[PDB]
Design an enzyme around this catalytic site. Structure first.
Site, PDB file in Angstrom:
ATOM      1  N   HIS A 200      33.838  -9.123 -11.631  1.00  0.00           N
ATOM      2  CA  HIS A 200      33.304  -8.698 -10.336  1.00  0.00           C
ATOM      3  C   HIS A 200      33.635  -7.221 -10.079  1.00  0.00           C
ATOM      4  O   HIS A 200      34.761  -6.780 -10.341  1.00  0.00           O
ATOM      5  CB  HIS A 200      33.885  -9.640  -9.246  1.00  0.00           C
ATOM      6  CG  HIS A 200      33.777  -9.127  -7.833  1.00  0.00           C
ATOM      7  ND1 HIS A 200      32.874  -9.629  -6.912  1.00  0.00           N
ATOM      8  CD2 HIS A 200      34.487  -8.176  -7.181  1.00  0.00           C
ATOM      9  CE1 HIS A 200      33.024  -8.992  -5.760  1.00  0.00           C
ATOM     10  NE2 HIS A 200      33.996  -8.107  -5.896  1.00  0.00           N
ATOM     11  N   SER A 201      32.655  -6.467  -9.578  1.00  0.00           N
ATOM     12  CA  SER A 201      32.828  -5.049  -9.204  1.00  0.00           C
ATOM     13  C   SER A 201      33.036  -4.185 -10.454  1.00  0.00           C
ATOM     14  O   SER A 201      32.179  -4.158 -11.326  1.00  0.00           O
ATOM     15  CB  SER A 201      33.981  -4.886  -8.194  1.00  0.00           C
ATOM     16  OG  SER A 201      33.908  -3.603  -7.544  1.00  0.00           O
ATOM     17  N   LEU A 202      34.168  -3.481 -10.553  1.00  0.00           N
ATOM     18  CA  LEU A 202      34.474  -2.784 -11.802  1.00  0.00           C
ATOM     19  C   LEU A 202      34.477  -3.783 -12.973  1.00  0.00           C
ATOM     20  O   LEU A 202      34.149  -3.428 -14.106  1.00  0.00           O
ATOM     21  CB  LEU A 202      35.820  -2.067 -11.690  1.00  0.00           C
ATOM     22  CG  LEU A 202      36.342  -1.308 -12.914  1.00  0.00           C
ATOM     23  CD1 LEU A 202      35.348  -0.253 -13.401  1.00  0.00           C
ATOM     24  CD2 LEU A 202      37.710  -0.667 -12.574  1.00  0.00           C
TER      25      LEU A 202
ATOM     26  N   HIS B 185      31.677  -7.073   0.100  1.00  0.00           N
ATOM     27  CA  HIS B 185      32.004  -7.000  -1.330  1.00  0.00           C
ATOM     28  C   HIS B 185      33.164  -7.938  -1.734  1.00  0.00           C
ATOM     29  O   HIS B 185      33.352  -8.202  -2.931  1.00  0.00           O
ATOM     30  CB  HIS B 185      32.379  -5.537  -1.642  1.00  0.00           C
ATOM     31  CG  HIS B 185      32.609  -5.224  -3.092  1.00  0.00           C
ATOM     32  ND1 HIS B 185      31.653  -5.419  -4.065  1.00  0.00           N
ATOM     33  CD2 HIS B 185      33.685  -4.691  -3.723  1.00  0.00           C
ATOM     34  CE1 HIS B 185      32.134  -5.034  -5.236  1.00  0.00           C
ATOM     35  NE2 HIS B 185      33.364  -4.584  -5.057  1.00  0.00           N
TER      36      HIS B 185
END
Ligand code: CA
Ligand code: CA
Ligand code: CA
Ligand code: CA
Ligand code: CA
Ligand code: CA
Ligand code: CA
Ligand code: CA
Length: 615
Positions: free
Chosen positions: A208-210, A316
């Site tokens: 997730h994300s990075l 997020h």
């Protein structure tokens, strides 16, 4: 044919659902419950006047949750909770010793980035085993921005440098991240997989994300590196700013109001990167809304939507991904969804859930199109559908539904659920098959609603211009202070029924079984054969023939230019009836996979557009 919003490559629907479940579990695990306190705080005190309290709880938790800070003896052990969850999903950590890995791991078994400039990267390697202890699959999960609680600040700073270089650094940087961070580890995992008789297709890769960026990065390197072992691996990325789309290896899943999700165009920084960036991408679910306290608030959205606007980052957080997207996956309507379906997911705090309607505001996004799915919570929800076609799911709790028009399916779920028409009852045609409530508005739009206990209207007079009136939904009719009002319908049961319309019947409900539904000279009748293989005998003009879900194989007699066909929540994605049609001599067959209806003595060129609704 609908394959589900999380469909992947050429997997069948059940297989892609199981892959998605695995991916989300391991992606979530990589964070080790770092946002546990934020989850509690947000739900308890919200994102408004209570935000200072929410932030405190995010940092130091309570007796019921653990915030970012480790070592407080009155917090519960949220890291143990995270391990239980991933183990329950079938996955357990594989040790460096088993892999013969010479790099760095910590006491929890987490793997650390190998190259200078990447040493704050984190990965988890997990295995799934059969009932006999044989390894059957491997999971690789990359952590997003953050790190172990014990080194949280220093670790996060290194992560942020990596994030900034992906956006503003040299070309190729994002693509290089996973190779530089975990190149050696991935080689060892491949040899370990081979040693156990597994191939690339037995590997799920998530984050997730990075961590989602790292998923796309690995995919981008997988044809050339590691002997090509991972070329055909299963790449499921959450909230990634980047997309690798060559070869169709990655599904990119996220919320459209998450400012990190799709922030980069491929890997390129563009002007939309710093504002709204909702141009659709081929690998992405482009239209899922995180309906939270920020999205709901006009006041919060007086500020421009941007990744530089820190409050927008609420959408997020990993707990919203885990909880919200599992509700999408488990929805009663899942088999009707597509990659780009508009889906509104209720993620409100306890502060707002009781006074805020979950609805498609279409805020900070391209105009939505197609049917809209709104997914409730296991709490008491307020859910409002729009003027187009809607699929509304209440789940557990006492839910209240509104809808502004069109053709709709409503599943109240458990609890005491209410449908609110917002107007005089006389303006709605109401009938009931014993389980499902049928409502037709003044424009001909039809709603089917399951598990509704109370139908609420708004009545008026010369004296009181507004009064909410509740009508109990019973087998014998609507019951209110005024008495009992029977439905204008004939209703069968589980058997093979013969139903003949009486002079004022507006509906015929065969229900289960193979029924025979016979019309009358006055026409204006709505035929609902229900499940099973039904015979529909149309008589006169202005009849409606109605079909929903798995409706079996019906035969339709007496169709003419004044009659109408209505299909709601049925197999097939096309909105053109010609796509379902085949002429078989004098009969017209309309096929919906496992269901179908044959119009006897009808040809396709005699049916006008306005005679058919596909909703
Ligand atoms: Ca990190
Ligand atoms: Ca969108
Ligand atoms: Ca609910
Ligand atoms: Ca609607
Ligand atoms: Ca409910
Ligand atoms: Ca029946
Ligand atoms: Ca039937
Ligand atoms: Ca039927």
């Amino acid at each position: 044919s609908h394959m589900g919003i999380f469909s992947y490559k050429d997997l069948d629907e059940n297989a892609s659902k199981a892959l998605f479940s695995d991916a989300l579990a391991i992606s979530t695990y990589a964070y080790h419950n770092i946002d546990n306190g934020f989850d509690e705080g947000y739900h308890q005190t919200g994102f408004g006047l209570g935000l200072p309290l929410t932030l405190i709880t995010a940092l130091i938790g309570s007796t019921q949750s653990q915030g970012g800070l480790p070592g407080l003896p009155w917090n519960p052990d949220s890291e143990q909770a995270a391990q239980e969850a991933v183990n329950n999903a079938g996955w357990s950590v594989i040790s460096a010793t088993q892999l013969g890995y010479a790099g760095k791991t910590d006491a929890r078994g987490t793997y650390y980035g190998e190259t200078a400039g990447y040493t704050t990267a984190q990965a988890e390697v997990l295995g799934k085993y059969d009932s006999e202890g044989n390894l059957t699959a491997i999971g690789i999960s990359f952590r997003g921005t953050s790190g172990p609680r014990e080194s949280l600040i220093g670790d996060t700073i290194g992560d942020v440098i990596n994030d900034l270089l992906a956006g503003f650094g040299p070309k190729g940087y994002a693509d290089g991240y996973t190779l530089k961070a975990f190149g050696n580890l991935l080689g060892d995992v491949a040899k370990f997989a081979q040693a156990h008789g597994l191939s690339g297709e037995d590997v799920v890769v998530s984050g997730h994300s990075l961590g989602g960026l790292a998923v796309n990065s690995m995919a981008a390197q997988s044809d050339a590196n590691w002997g090509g072992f991972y070329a055909q691996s299963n790449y499921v990325a959450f909230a990634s700013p980047t997309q690798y789309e060559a070869g169709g290896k990655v599904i990119n899943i996220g919320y459209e109001n998450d400012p990190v999700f799709r922030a980069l165009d491929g890997t390129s920084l563009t002007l939309p990167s710093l504002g709204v960036h909702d141009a659709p991408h081929t690998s992405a679910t482009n239209n899922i809304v995180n309906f939270n306290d920020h999205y709901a608030s006009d006041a919060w959205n007086l500020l421009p939507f941007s990744i530089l606007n820190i409050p927008t980052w609420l959408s997020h957080l990993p707990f919203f991904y885990q909880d919200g997207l599992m509700r999408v996956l488990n929805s009663e309507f899942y088999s009707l969804t597509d990659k780009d379906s508009t889906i509104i997911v209720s993620n409100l705090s306890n502060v707002t859930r009781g006074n805020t309607w979950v609805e498609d505001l279409n805020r900070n996004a391209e105009t939505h199109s197609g049917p809209t799915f709104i997914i409730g919570s296991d709490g008491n929800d307020l859910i409002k559908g729009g003027k187009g076609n809607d699929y509304l799911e209440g789940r557990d709790g006492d839910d209240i539904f509104r809808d502004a028009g069109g053709y709709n399916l409503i599943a109240g779920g458990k609890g005491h659920n209410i449908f609110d028409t917002q107007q005089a009852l006389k303006n709605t045609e109401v009938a009931y098959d014993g389980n499902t409530l049928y409502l037709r508005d003044a424009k001909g739009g039809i709603t089917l609603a399951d598990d509704i206990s109370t139908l609420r209207s708004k009545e008026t007079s010369w004296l009181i211009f507004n009064k909410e009136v509740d009508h109990q939904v019973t087998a014998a009719g609507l019951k209110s202070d005024s008495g009992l009002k029977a439905y204008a319908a004939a209703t069968g049961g589980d058997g093979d029924d013969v139903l003949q319309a009486r002079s004022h019947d507006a509906w015929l409900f065969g229900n289960a079984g193979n029924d025979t539904l016979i019309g009358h000279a006055g026409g204006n009748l709505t035929f609902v054969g229900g499940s099973g293989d039904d015979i529909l005998k149309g008589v006169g003009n202005g009849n409606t023939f109605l079909f929903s879900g798995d409706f079996g194989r019906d035969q339709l007699y007496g169709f003419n230019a004044s009659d109408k066909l209505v299909f709601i929540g049925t197999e097939g994605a096309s909105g053109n009836i010609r796509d379902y049609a085949t002429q078989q001599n004098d009969d017209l067959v309309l096929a919906f996979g496992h269901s179908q209806v044959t119009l006897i003595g009808v040809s396709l060129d005699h049916i006008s557009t306005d005679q058919v609704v596909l909703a």
